[PDB]
Amino acid sequence: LALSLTADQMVSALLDAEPPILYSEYDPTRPFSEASMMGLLTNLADRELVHMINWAKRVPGFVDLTLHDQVHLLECAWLEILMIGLVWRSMEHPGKLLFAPNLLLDRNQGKCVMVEIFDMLLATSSRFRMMNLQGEEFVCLKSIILLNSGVYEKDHIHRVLDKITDTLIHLMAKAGLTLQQQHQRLAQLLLILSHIRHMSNKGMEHLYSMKCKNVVPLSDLLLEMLDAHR
Amino acid sequence: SLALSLTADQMVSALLDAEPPILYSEYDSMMGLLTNLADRELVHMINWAKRVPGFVDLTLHDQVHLLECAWLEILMIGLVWRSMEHPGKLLFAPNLLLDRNQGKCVEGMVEIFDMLLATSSRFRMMNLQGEEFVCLKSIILLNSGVYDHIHRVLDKITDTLIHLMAKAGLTLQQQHQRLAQLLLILSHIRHMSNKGMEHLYSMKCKNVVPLSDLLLEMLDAH
Amino acid sequence: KILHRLLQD
Amino acid sequence: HKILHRLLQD
Ligand SMILES: Oc1ccc(C(c2ccccc2)=C2[C@H]3CCC[C@@H]2CCC3)cc1
Ligand SMILES: Oc1ccc(C(c2ccccc2)=C2[C@H]3CCC[C@@H]2CCC3)cc1
Numbered sequence: 059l060a061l062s063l064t065a066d067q068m069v070s071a072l073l074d075a076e077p078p079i080l081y082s083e084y085d086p087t088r089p090f091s092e093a094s095m096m097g098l099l100t101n102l103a104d105r106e107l108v109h110m111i112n113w114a115k116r117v118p119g120f121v122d123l124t125l126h127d128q129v130h131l132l133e134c135a136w137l138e139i140l141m142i143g144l145v146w147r148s149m150e151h152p153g154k155l156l157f158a159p160n161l162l163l164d165r166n167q168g169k170c171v172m173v174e175i176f177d178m179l180l181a182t183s184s185r186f187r188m189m190n191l192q193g194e195e196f197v198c199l200k201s202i203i204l205l206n207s208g209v210y211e212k213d214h215i216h217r218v219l220d221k222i223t224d225t226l227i228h229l230m231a232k233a234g235l236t237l238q239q240q241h242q243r244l245a246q247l248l249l250i251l252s253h254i255r256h257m258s259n260k261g262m263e264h265l266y267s268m269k270c271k272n273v274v275p276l277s278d279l280l281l282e283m284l285d286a287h288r
Numbered sequence: 289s290l291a292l293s294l295t296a297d298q299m300v301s302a303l304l305d306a307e308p309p310i311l312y313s314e315y316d317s318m319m320g321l322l323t324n325l326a327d328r329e330l331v332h333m334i335n336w337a338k339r340v341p342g343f344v345d346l347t348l349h350d351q352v353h354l355l356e357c358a359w360l361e362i363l364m365i366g367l368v369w370r371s372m373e374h375p376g377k378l379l380f381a382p383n384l385l386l387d388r389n390q391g392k393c394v395e396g397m398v399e400i401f402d403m404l405l406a407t408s409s410r411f412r413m414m415n416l417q418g419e420e421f422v423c424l425k426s427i428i429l430l431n432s433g434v435y436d437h438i439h440r441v442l443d444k445i446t447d448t449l450i451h452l453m454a455k456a457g458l459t460l461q462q463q464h465q466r467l468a469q470l471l472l473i474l475s476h477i478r479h480m481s482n483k484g485m486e487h488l489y490s491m492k493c494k495n496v497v498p499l500s501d502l503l504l505e506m507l508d509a510h
Numbered sequence: 511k512i513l514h515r516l517l518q519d
Numbered sequence: 520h521k522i523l524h525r526l527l528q529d
Contacts, residue, residue: 209403219472223468238447241450254475255478255479255482263486278512352523
């Protein structure tokens with residue numbers, strides 16, 4: 059059923075599936091303590107997850123999978139998906155990470171808890187800005203991340219991935235890119251996904267380092283998503 | 289750059305000529321054998337890297353960082369490639385062929401074994417070619433830095449991959465789909481390397497395995 | 511598993 | 520020096 063969409067219909071479906079940009083519960087009229095930063099991020103991420111889950115259901119081909127595989131994919135990809143969203147939002151804000159419109163993180167703040175993770179997220183963000191990443195391309199890449207998270211039902215995922223690839227190529231071709239440019243742009247975008255996978259695993263480690271240190275008040279949901287990674 | 293001075297066929301030929309040899313497991317304990325094997329593989333890998341077009345053009349600082357970031361990934365794609373003719377088995381060496389059950393007595397490795405086997409299976413189903421393999425491995429090296437010349441060489445290898453597929457009789461549509469799938473597998477290799485790195489560091493901390501000086505330095509980069 | 515409940519509808 | 524550093528220039 060997802061294999062019967064056009065490239066324009068695929069883009070249209072993915073754009074409609076997009077979750078909203080959420081706000082943090084940061085109070086601007088009151089002085090912000092640096093030690094409460096992880097509290098804001100945890101609270102934010104936990105609320106983002108619900109919107110992400112319903113976004114996944116609206117990704118063509120996802121519901122066609124069994125409940126088990128839907129769970130495994132979401133468990134594997136959730137931090138990656140949060141990160142590519144974060145990276146996308148931080149494009150027009152050079153040097154900083156836009157977790158929320160009312161939650162901007164600068165490099166020196168990272169030195170209070172995460173500096174290495176910060177620099178990699180910025181580098182990924184600026185690279186998207188350098189490549190002038192488009193919103194249509196963004197939703198394709200994010201859907202690819204979801205479907206490609208599981209390392210170890212099978213052929214269906216493959217056919218949908220090919221479908222999103224054609225969609226991406228169709229977008230680049232519609233923009234006026236030559237055949238060579240389409241291949242090169244497609245290559246660079248998917249190579250950035252490896253960096254996103256890398257950052258996700260490091261962030262997961264960082265989350266374990268703090269969860270064991272009783273530094274991050276996590277929800278039952280986040281504990282469940284985190285425990286999936288050993 | 290030399291990489292930008294080569295044709296597509298010249299690029300393939302240079303990468304194939306740069307290939308390290310398949311080594312054997314040696315006596316001097318499963319982790320002991322793996323550590324000794326990997327350590328000797330690393331020496332050939334560094335020599336291989338210097339033979340990858342565009343890599344020498346980098347400053348020695350940049351070369352160190354890329355290798356420090358990629359080394360386990362490169363070991364893994366090599367392992368995965370060597371294992372393609374042995375379903376359900378990992379060919380670390382011709383005299384060291386292991387299944388998932390051998391990765392139990394070390395903790396945290398049997399999960400990595402399963403992922404390596406699944407990755408090997410994917411390359412098998414895709415009918416991955418040697419020419420494609422050496423392109424991917426070079427891409428892994430140059431993309432390891434999550435941290436314009438490198439981008440240019442990466443585009444060159446991309447064109448080279450497309451060239452190989454076109455030569456094989458694949459249509460343009462089949463070309464970008466196959467390219468996409470291969471590059472998506474690189475995300476899985478990155479993932480496996482991160483987990484492997486975690487396992488190695490924990491084993492070092494627990495003082496259960498004696499990693500070599502080079503491996504200690506490489507691991508200490510992460 | 512909480513993810514199961516949220517994945518409904 | 521670092522072993523990797525020396526091997527790359529050797
Ligand atoms: O949109 C996002 C994206 C990532 C995050 C989170 C996060 C996730 C779960 C719980 C707490 C924090 C993180 C963590 C910690 C530091 C910031 C970022 C990136 C790396 C992992 C938060 C919001
Ligand atoms: O070609 C390879 C590939 C991987 C390995 C090694 C290895 C690496 C460094 C030191 C010791 C062992 C490993 C380790 C242990 C389990 C097998 C694999 C994969 C994940 C980490 C060794 C040789």
